[PDB]
Enzyme design. Sequence first.
Site, short mmCIF file in Angstrom:
data_model
loop_
_atom_site.label_atom_id
_atom_site.label_comp_id
_atom_site.label_asym_id
_atom_site.label_seq_id
_atom_site.Cartn_x
_atom_site.Cartn_y
_atom_site.Cartn_z
N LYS B 6 0.93 -1.28 0.29
CA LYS B 6 -0.15 -0.06 -0.06
C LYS B 6 0.95 1.38 -0.19
O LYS B 6 0.63 2.15 -0.81
CB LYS B 6 -0.81 -0.03 1.25
CG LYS B 6 -2.17 -0.91 1.19
CD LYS B 6 -3.20 -0.60 2.42
CE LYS B 6 -4.15 -1.37 2.55
NZ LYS B 6 -3.79 -2.99 2.61
N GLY B 95 -17.66 0.91 -1.51
CA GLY B 95 -17.96 0.11 -0.59
C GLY B 95 -17.86 0.77 0.96
O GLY B 95 -18.70 0.21 1.78
N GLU B 102 -16.99 10.60 -4.41
CA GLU B 102 -15.82 10.02 -5.31
C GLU B 102 -15.98 10.09 -6.70
O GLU B 102 -15.27 10.33 -7.73
CB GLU B 102 -15.59 8.67 -4.75
CG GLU B 102 -15.01 8.49 -3.39
CD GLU B 102 -14.64 7.39 -3.19
OE1 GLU B 102 -14.72 6.29 -3.61
OE2 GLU B 102 -13.58 7.62 -2.26
#
Lengths: 217, 217
Positions: B6, B95, B102
């Site tokens: 990440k 989710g 967004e």
Amino acid sequence: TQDEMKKAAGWAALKYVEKGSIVGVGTGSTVNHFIDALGTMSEEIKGAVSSSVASTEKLEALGIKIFDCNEVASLDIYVDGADEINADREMIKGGGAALTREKIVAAIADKFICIVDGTKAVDVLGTFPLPVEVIPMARSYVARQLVKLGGDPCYREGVITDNGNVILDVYGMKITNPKQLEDQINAIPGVVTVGLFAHRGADVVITGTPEGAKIEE
Amino acid sequence: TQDEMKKAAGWAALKYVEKGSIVGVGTGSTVNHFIDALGTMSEEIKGAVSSSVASTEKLEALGIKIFDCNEVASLDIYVDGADEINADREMIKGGGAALTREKIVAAIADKFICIVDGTKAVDVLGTFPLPVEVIPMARSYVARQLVKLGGDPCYREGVITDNGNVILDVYGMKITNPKQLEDQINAIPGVVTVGLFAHRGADVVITGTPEGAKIEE
């Protein structure tokens, strides 16, 4: 002109109302005459679903039971007006009432009974500005996108929808291909609902004329 | 999932940040690393537009100015993670973040940089449930229609979006034509936003791998 033809038209819709049913009800002066007709059979009807505060307060006062859309799997009919209707029975709606609630109750309804005066029938949808409900953070974005589509979007300032969204009224469009334009605007991020009822339009049209209303379904 | 992967992915995105620009910024752990990166260049950028309450806080900590979407006409980049991404760069998003925010910030940005670890790529979208934001009075209706499209819509109880809307998380879909499905859902009356980023997908994918960040332009 002549909400005598408005009343002819509105009472003309009572023939679509079945014993034992829940009736979908829109708004407008011509629907409000249909609500006067409908109370004439308050007793024979299970209740109503409404897309309008004014109508539901009116139906209640006539003692007609109010249902929530989430309590029904469908409605037999939705009785409403329109701002414009074309020969193919595609409509602009939401210029003067709750655009998103109207589109949702019309979607759940089997048959849409459009109830109009002489001024609503058009060649090409679009003289009447097309209402578009927009998430507020997207308003300048959606407006840029409508310009690319050849509209002239005007923000309805000083008001919001119950949801808190803003309205853009889109001027200047010659809406040949209403189904396609409905597609296009429904695709713009930040758009909530578009006042083109083109994929699902009117099933019966009842037009108020001087001699008592024209059921040209 | 590895935080170092990440971390690699979020830092690599920093190469895409032009000096003097206002940066579109997403949410999540991967993006938090990007925000760290952006800290290293803060007195070199005009500001940031964020889709996340928590991302705004972090950017403010760094003294980065915050702009709203109505204050800009475009963004050069938007940098964000994804729930799922197919090989065509189409994403399921929303989710566990602000879905409508967004999709509007991504619609405004020129270039979408998707930063991911190895767990986000999928062969076909749909295992991860597809979020659909819905007008509350339309909930059962839209769920009936999602079931018609092959899905298993599950109402995300107990919560609403900023806008007061409900979310249906849709399980069991095999999303072989993401652009079509987006079109179909976008046309159900009552849908506000669908978590399918299909017509406007990622332009750059930076995946964090056990080796380093891998960039797919």
